[PDB]
Write a protein that binds this ligand. Sequence first.
Ligand SMILES: *[C@@H]1O[C@H](CO)[C@@H](O[C@@H]2O[C@H](CO)[C@@H](O)[C@H](O)[C@H]2NC(C)=O)[C@H](O)[C@H]1NC(C)=O
Ligand SMILES: *[C@@H]1O[C@H](CO)[C@@H](O[C@@H]2O[C@H](CO)[C@@H](O)[C@H](O)[C@H]2NC(C)=O)[C@H](O)[C@H]1NC(C)=O
Ligand SMILES: *[C@@H]1O[C@H](CO)[C@@H](O[C@@H]2O[C@H](CO)[C@@H](O)[C@H](O)[C@H]2NC(C)=O)[C@H](O)[C@H]1NC(C)=O
Ligand SMILES: *[C@@H]1O[C@H](CO)[C@@H](O[C@@H]2O[C@H](CO)[C@@H](O)[C@H](O)[C@H]2NC(C)=O)[C@H](O)[C@H]1NC(C)=O
Ligand code: NAG
Ligand code: NAG
Ligand code: NAG
Ligand code: NAG
Ligand code: NAG
Lengths: 977, 214, 49, 97
Amino acid sequence: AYTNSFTRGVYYPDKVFRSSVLHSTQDLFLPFFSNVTWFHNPVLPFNDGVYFASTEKSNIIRGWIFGTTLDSKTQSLLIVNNATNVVIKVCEFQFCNDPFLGVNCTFEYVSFKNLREFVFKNIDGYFKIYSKHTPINLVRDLPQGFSALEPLVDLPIGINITRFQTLLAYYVGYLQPRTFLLKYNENGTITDAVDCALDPLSETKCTLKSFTVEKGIYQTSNFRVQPTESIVRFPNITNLCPFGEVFNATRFASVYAWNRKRISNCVADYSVLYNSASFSTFKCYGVSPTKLNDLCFTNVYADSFVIRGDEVRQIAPGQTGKIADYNYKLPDDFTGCVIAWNSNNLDNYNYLYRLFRKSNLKPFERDISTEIYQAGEGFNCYFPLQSYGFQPTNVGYQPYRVVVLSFELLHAPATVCGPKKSTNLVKNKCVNFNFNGLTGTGVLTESNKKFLPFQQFGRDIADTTDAVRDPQTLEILDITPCSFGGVSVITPGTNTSNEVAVLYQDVNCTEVNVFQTRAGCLIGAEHVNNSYECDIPIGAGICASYQTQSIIAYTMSLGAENSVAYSNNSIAIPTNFTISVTTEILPVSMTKTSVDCTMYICGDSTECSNLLLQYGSFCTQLNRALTGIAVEQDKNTQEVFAQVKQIYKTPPIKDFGGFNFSQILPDPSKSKRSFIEDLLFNKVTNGLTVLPPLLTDEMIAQYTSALLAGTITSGWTFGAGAALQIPFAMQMAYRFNGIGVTQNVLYENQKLIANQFNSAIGKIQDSLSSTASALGKLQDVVNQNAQALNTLVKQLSSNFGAISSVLNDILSRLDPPEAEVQIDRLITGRLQSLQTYVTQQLIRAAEIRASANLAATKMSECVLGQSKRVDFCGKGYHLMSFPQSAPHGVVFLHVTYVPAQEKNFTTAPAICHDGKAHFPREGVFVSNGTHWFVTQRNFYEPQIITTDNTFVSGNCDVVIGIVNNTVYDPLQPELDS
Amino acid sequence: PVSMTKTSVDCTMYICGDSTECSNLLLQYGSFCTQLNRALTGIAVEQDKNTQEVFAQVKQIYKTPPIKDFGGFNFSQILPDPSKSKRSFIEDLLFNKVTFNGLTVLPPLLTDEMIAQYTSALLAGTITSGWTFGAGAALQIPFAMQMAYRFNGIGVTQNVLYENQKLIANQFNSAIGKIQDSLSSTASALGKLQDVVNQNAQALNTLVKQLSSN
Amino acid sequence: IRASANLAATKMSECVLGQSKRVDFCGKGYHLMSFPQSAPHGVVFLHVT
Amino acid sequence: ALDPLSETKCTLKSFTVEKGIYQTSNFRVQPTESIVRFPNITNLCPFGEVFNATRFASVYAWNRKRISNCVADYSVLYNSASFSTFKCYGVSPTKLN
Ligand SMILES: *[C@@H]1O[C@H](CO)[C@@H](O[C@@H]2O[C@H](CO)[C@@H](O)[C@H](O)[C@H]2NC(C)=O)[C@H](O)[C@H]1NC(C)=O
Ligand SMILES: *[C@@H]1O[C@H](CO)[C@@H](O[C@@H]2O[C@H](CO)[C@@H](O)[C@H](O)[C@H]2NC(C)=O)[C@H](O)[C@H]1NC(C)=O
Ligand SMILES: *[C@@H]1O[C@H](CO)[C@@H](O[C@@H]2O[C@H](CO)[C@@H](O)[C@H](O)[C@H]2NC(C)=O)[C@H](O)[C@H]1NC(C)=O
Ligand SMILES: *[C@@H]1O[C@H](CO)[C@@H](O[C@@H]2O[C@H](CO)[C@@H](O)[C@H](O)[C@H]2NC(C)=O)[C@H](O)[C@H]1NC(C)=O
Ligand SMILES: *[C@@H]1O[C@H](CO)[C@@H](O)[C@H](O)[C@H]1NC(C)=O
Ligand SMILES: *[C@@H]1O[C@H](CO)[C@@H](O)[C@H](O)[C@H]1NC(C)=O
Ligand SMILES: *[C@@H]1O[C@H](CO)[C@@H](O)[C@H](O)[C@H]1NC(C)=O
Ligand SMILES: *[C@@H]1O[C@H](CO)[C@@H](O)[C@H](O)[C@H]1NC(C)=O
Ligand SMILES: *[C@@H]1O[C@H](CO)[C@@H](O)[C@H](O)[C@H]1NC(C)=O
């Protein structure tokens, strides 16, 4: 009986208070939209926890029986209240056949209209009961709303639970170990949650840690093709190996003449050998004592010899002693296991050992000599070998026999495998294959490789096995894992819709409305053959958008296709223009953070200081790097603002040629900042210390005010040298003369361009107030700094592989010896995190210093002067820039010249009047069809062609494209007329 | 050098991919490979941003008329060839003279054909309208007049240009021919890009052989 | 690569999209105009000087 | 350890210190004392029924009593005069708590 579950089945993960923050935890929860079970006393499993939703009207339900067997075999839960006293326990009470009450006791706790939810779970021996009583007027199903079940009391019972039944309309679900995102309000309660295991939209919400995610594409997880079956491939070597001939062996040799037997064409069944208690010690180093039955070796050696009791530790890689020195030594990197019995009962003057010898012998080497003593042939120097002091009449002095299984894992034709069963071979199906111990996921295809009779398998550059010769049937098969890649979700924005699309990167649709593109398989978006200017990039020019509504998938429009009318004698000249300014925001500085080794890592810890003193000059180096970053931030601030020595002020009058500067002029009402600057300040908002900048908010506002005021009052002379005041009209005239247009058209168009600049400042006001995307770079820099800080802090809460993350707990819990290595691991992890942080900080400082040098050059050559570089101070011919203060950044007001209206005109490369070619001083030769004119390059100012604008030069029968014309000469009227 | 190959490497998939126990053990290291993945995807999106800022600086794709009347200046060596992708002779020569373990190379947002189209738009608008296509509206201008203004930009009068335009066009054409000869014979011109891509491939091969390291 | 890419974007917006007057910025000699061409992960210029 | 000038000289590894500002150590107000906060003595074990108990059982009728949520006051037993002997094996009698 399926049913909807909006948000029910949520409980507090712990007893920690949180205010207006989002915390994500993983615990046994009821997934969203997970149909539960509806009823109207079945024993239902408790595999991973169940969520209970009860609808009681007459208290028909009194209790439950929780456990695994729940048949009076183990302790079973009982909770009853006889209307006056509540009895709660897992008490081993004398339950009836069907346990009830008339209408070994470990826990002594013997004390519709409303929806009663319950969560009965036990973890780490402490029973956690959750409950919630809320009214409702509905009888169909679970209603709309959210409720977090509160753990009222903790009960130390410590009982297993896998089955349960109801003792009497109720609902039962199932908890699963999924990732959940919880939201806490200002009062400290949970209002809503998001399960990021439901759908890609919730996955995106989960990976962004926000209930409302912005429109775009985000990587959430990795799409992996799960193995559909399991292939076992081993050769037909069913010949059982006589391991009894070495374990049940009645004969063994001494250590001085240890015999070795090569083992091949065998079946290694380590099951009975491992399960037998005959092995007093089973110390496997290269392999595992329990994982022996599944491995398969190519060739191994078996060595048998006898050793004393105290020398058992000497049979190990990297050991010394009498035997390990002069009789028999093991490899320092020996792989295998050592078998030593309590042979006191099993294993007498015939066990020998060497005493004197030249030097150590190589591992697995056999040296046999019965003469040539060290110092003291028939002289004092004699038989250098003595027997052990054993006897059938004779704990530590008793003999212990040792056997070593030297497991040689060298690449060779497999001969000794474990007792595994081979399966049929499938192809083109990623499964859990096992080729002579080699496991993995991939496809088994018939390869065309020509393996040589001795070469067994192939490898790639990655040292991974590329091909494997099937040991049963001699064929060559390639190993190639099938599709995998990150999962990217396309969300148009939760503020608009909740319909999303999924993009599989470089995966064909045969493996996972379905569309296949160059980037892979696209699911959730309908393919569209049309083209639009997209916003969410998909890959290879594919794009997604939300239009009339659904998600459309299309190839991107490379731009508004405008085939130009290029020709030999056609030209267009601007007649109207718009003074449009662009808010170019460039971050210049960062938060001057400083970090101390002790305070950050394990502040106020003498043991920490003593252990870190052994790490050398890491601390002084890191502190020097961070102080250098801080002083470099200060130097960038100086180089970008403190470029003018004197602080200029505006006159009491504000007759700025009709230009309204009140939005850019400082306001002393507060911080002497402008209106735009005030809005920017309003629209932009442990061991670590935020060092105050050398120029704090007030001083930096004062200096930016000085900069912009000196600019608007004196053009560029204040930066060139002594500040020479100039009228703003003449300043605009010079800025115009700096891009190739004369001042006459200005002083004609003055009132209209003043009104245009005013309306432009107003539109910039509106934009900077409404759309906060212009300050996106500053917001990203601030968020990156805050995220790096939060990461550096949350690393302090991570374990770094240690037992815990609280140094206080660690030092109060662990003994000094183990605490040394634990704090060493902690120092390694925390110093690695701090090194990553400081390297990323130096990287961000390098990029911010690049952008800061760019901003200083821009301001020193564009505000202090006038940039002439194309597209350096905004699109189009640049006029002037006005700076504005910004938190850790700078805002520019790039006054640019942009053409608006054009006209088609007939042109010619030159004109000929009397056999001589004429050329303009500064302009363009054009015509409107019947009369010829000459005008500027960036504005249509048609004038008669005067010799004050052209000149006579050369001839006309060598130049191409020249046309006839009549030239004006401002002295020729004077002479003739 | 302009862009890098977009090496996107999943932290887990590289270090000990396809292992639940090892992923759980790496989870104990905080957000080392999480922050590392975020930083590497930041490098990827930043490379795409660089590609955009270096190529997609215009919002209009321009095309030249079928008549290649550029005043005698051959451009088919630099103008895209529609007989094949939409790349030019020099571009095709450059494409010809220069040629699976969790390290996935994400395809660029701007593929080879789209980059060819961007380059076509840019150089076509240039040769057809001087600087007006970048300043404001694309105001077409005679190429001879454009050369005249360029010469007036360095301090020489266009009179000598129009007297010696035949020889100047011949010199530009012979320079295009010599540059064809060079970019076809001596491939050391793209040595910078070759060393960049070789450093990228060497870093990748080092990262791969590290899995072979113990 | 990003510093050289800012350099290349400036060179293009100043030399293809316009005409730099900085000496030794668009190649040796007085600059006239440049022409970009598609290159794998890169770009080349034809600096007319 | 004498004066800030000497502190700068000793942290800069030199006898001559040029003009400037230098960070020598970390000034930290050390904790003046310690404070221990823990729940009430409530939820106290019925240890009076075993420690100050009146009646006990025989040797062959030793029954186990699983008492839960207890507070182990051992000072009274450590200093008890009504109990003549306090011989303690498993741990140290002074660190029973
Ligand atoms: C090693 O030798 C012992 C001694 O014979 C073997 O144990 C006997 O085990 C078999 C197997 O079931 C029984 O049928 C016999 O009855 C056992 N002997 C006695 C006296 O009860 C043992 O199987 C041999 N192999 C190993 C690996 O221990
Ligand atoms: C250049 O364009 C501007 C557009 O802003 C023109 O200004 C407008 O003139 C018309 C007259 O037909 C008025 O109706 C509009 O209200 C004006 N715009 C604003 C914002 O007030 C300007 O006239 C154009 N220049 C020329 C010479 O035509
Ligand atoms: C500059 O523009 C501002 C608009 O931001 C003008 O201020 C307004 O002035 C009028 C007339 O007194 C008031 O009714 C408005 O309330 C003002 N605006 C605001 C937001 O308060 C200012 O007068 C302009 N100055 C010049 C010299 O043109
Ligand atoms: C090209 O420009 C000329 C110059 O203004 C235009 O000639 C004018 O036409 C008006 C008609 O209303 C006459 O009153 C003027 O005397 C003419 N000017 C001259 C200098 O003769 C001419 O009309 C324009 N051509 C077109 C097709 O618009
Ligand atoms: C819980 O299961 C374990 C499994 O070995 C078992 O030993 C234990 O006795 C069980 N608990 C109870 C109360 O029986
Ligand atoms: C430009 O091309 C057109 C195409 O028809 C041609 O008529 C004209 O003569 C050309 N220009 C010159 C100056 O030859
Ligand atoms: C100039 O002529 C071209 C080609 O006829 C045309 O596309 C364009 O719109 C004309 N310009 C104006 C301003 O009408
Ligand atoms: C380009 O050069 C070739 C030489 O093979 C010539 O035939 C062709 O006419 C030239 N292009 C133009 C537009 O003149
Ligand atoms: C136990 O009894 C003795 C004797 O009256 C008394 O001193 C002691 O305080 C009692 N124990 C406790 C925990 O009060």
